[PDB]
Write a protein that binds this ligand. Structure first.
Ligand SMILES: [Cu+2]
Length: 108
């Protein structure tokens, strides 16, 4: 977890919106089962894509203000921001392979 950014409603506008590059935001909560699966593979993802991707997590129970700004309906939901704009969206549980496919198709 040394490369995973911990976001809050208070730092989202700065850490995400004012950043140029690609940032993957993982919206999760402790009660969400599928979220735990995705969480166990992020450290590997952050290492493999470092230099071209930053991985961040935001707990919606502790920080309830951000998700509604993007109309998120449920979790897990992964949003890929590029220079402060949503460039890709993925909802539901996914295997390591599917996540890697989602990233390769959307990054550069
Ligand atoms: Cu780490």
């Amino acid at each position: 977890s040394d490369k995973i950014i911990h976001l809050t409603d208070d730092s989202f506008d700065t850490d995400v919106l004012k950043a140029d590059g690609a940032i993957l935001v993982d919206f999760w909560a402790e009660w969400c089962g599928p979220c735990k699966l995705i969480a166990s593979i992020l450290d590997e993802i952050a290492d493999e894509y470092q230099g071209k991707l930053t991985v961040a997590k935001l707990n919606i129970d502790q920080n309830p203000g951000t998700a509604p700004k993007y109309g998120i309906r449920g979790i897990p939901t992964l949003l890929l921001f590029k220079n402060g704009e949503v460039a890709a969206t993925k909802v539901g549980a996914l295997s390591k392979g599917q996540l890697k496919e989602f990233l390769d198709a959307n990054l550069a």
